[PDB]
Amino acid sequence: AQSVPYGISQIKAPALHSQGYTGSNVKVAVIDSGIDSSHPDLNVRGGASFVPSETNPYQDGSSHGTHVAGTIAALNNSIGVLGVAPSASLYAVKVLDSTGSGQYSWIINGIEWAISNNMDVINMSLGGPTGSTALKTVVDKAVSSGIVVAAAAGNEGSSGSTSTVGYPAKYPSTIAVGAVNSSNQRASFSSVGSELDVMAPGVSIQSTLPGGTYGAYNGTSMATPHVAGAAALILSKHPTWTNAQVRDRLESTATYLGNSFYYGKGLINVQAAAQ
Ligand SMILES: [Ca+2]
Ligand SMILES: [Ca+2]
């Protein structure tokens, strides 16, 4: 039996599926710890590793690259879960090792690979309190080149009036994604700040795990792939739209949930975004 995780429904992805749009031909780079390319509920088209200690992008010792991949594009079939964009072309761009850690140089090499391989969408469920000019440059380059880049806002909660949004989410060029629960309340851990753009389900998100299993995780790192996946859905329905159009629709049609410091434009609604 296949389950549809609550988050997939919450963002209204099934509406697109019902229209015959599932992310076909859209190239999504999962810039993370790799993807277990053998998972029965995943199909991985290509990729590359930039982690010195881990040469194979199709093995995932962290679990998170595989989990993120499943939220984006877990296959529509009789098993497991269902991705926001179940027909999307997944690429495993390994820049984090099995500890979920990576150097900015590795991450940068991964973004460079995504650009030179003409990805349509980048998912970066990764963040730190700081970044670097070289990181900003390549991120901005990916976006100016035409790629939709979604990045996790961070799990640093609130701190009075100061931003707790991490990088690369902090860069204006990326879509910074915060986490709500199934009630549309911001999760207590969700980072806040003027850099916040949209929200997506990020509490107990069920997805694929290496080895052919499934499990749930909390975090903005799990909210982000809903937005990456939504971008792919939108592109499959509207192949001629630029990344700027895609982002504008996602933000402009979001469901208002509260003050933007905490919720950005609110919850993505891919049905409205792709209308
Ligand atoms: Ca499935
Ligand atoms: Ca941003």
- Name every residue whose Cβ is closer than 8 Å to that of residue 254 and which is 6 or more positions away in sequence: 198, 199, 264, 265, 266, 267, 268, 269
Using CA atoms, how far apart are residues 149 and 62, in angstroms rounded to an integer?
22
Report yes or no: 265 and 198 within 8 Å, Cβ to Cβ.
yes
**With the C-alpha atoms ordered 230, 192, 96, 109, is the resulting torsion angle positive or negative?**
positive
Token readout for 191 is: 């980072």
CB atoms within 10 A of CB 258: 14
Which ligand is located closest to the Cα atom of residue 176?
2
CA atoms within 13 A on the CB side of 64: 25
Report yes or no: 205 and 224 within 8 Å, Cβ to Cβ.
no
Strand 213-217 and strand 205-209: the pairing is antiparallel
Q: Which stretches of the chain are assigned E, i.e. beta strand?
A: 27-32, 44-49, 89-94, 121-124, 148-152, 175-180, 198-201, 205-209, 213-217
Give residue 79 CA to ligand 2 midpoint distance, Å. Answer: 35
| Euclidean distance between the first and the last CA atom of the chain, given in angstroms as a whole number | 31
**Residue 97 labeled ligand binder:** no
Give residue 169 CA to ligand 2 midpoint distance, Å. Answer: 4
- Name every residue whose Cβ is closer than 8 Å to that of residue 110 and which is 6 or more positions away in sequence: 29, 31, 48, 50, 93, 94, 95
b/e string for 41-77 if b means 16 or more Cβ within 10 A?
Answer: bbbbebbbbbbeebeebebbbbbbbbbbbbbbbbbbe
- Name every residue whose Cβ is closer than 8 Å to that of residue 103 and which is 6 or more positions away in sequence: none
- Name every residue whose Cβ is closer than 8 Å to that of residue 100 and which is 6 or more positions away in sequence: 33, 62, 64, 126
Residue 204 burial class via C-beta count within 10 angstroms: exposed 0-12, middle 13-18, buried 19 and up: middle
Using CA atoms, how far apart are residues 10 and 213, in angstroms rounded to an integer?
23
**Residue 60 labeled ligand binder:** no
User: What residues are annotated to the active site?
Assistant: 32, 64, 221
**Residue 81 labeled ligand binder:** yes
Fold of 1-275: Rossmann fold (3.40.50)
Resolution of this entry, Å:
1.7
Q: Match 């030179």 to its residue by tokens.
A: 116
Using CA atoms, how far apart are residues 92 and 73, in angstroms rounded to an integer?
12
Give residue 18 CA to ligand 2 midpoint distance, Å. Answer: 31
**Alpha-carbon Rg of the chain, whole angstroms?**
16
**Residue 75 labeled ligand binder:** yes
Q: Match 């969700």 to its residue by tokens.
A: 190
Give residue 141 CA to ligand 2 midpoint distance, Å. Answer: 14
- SS3 category, 108: helix
Beta sheet of 27-32, edge-to-edge order: 44-49, 89-94, 27-32, 121-124, 148-152, 175-180, 198-201
Using CA atoms, how far apart are residues 216 and 99, in angstroms rounded to an integer?
18
Task: Return residues with CB closer than 5 A to ligand 1 (ion).
Answer: 2, 41, 75, 77, 80
**Residue 140 labeled ligand binder:** no
Token readout for 160 is: 């009075």
Give residue 270 CA to ligand 1 midpoint distance, Å. Answer: 20
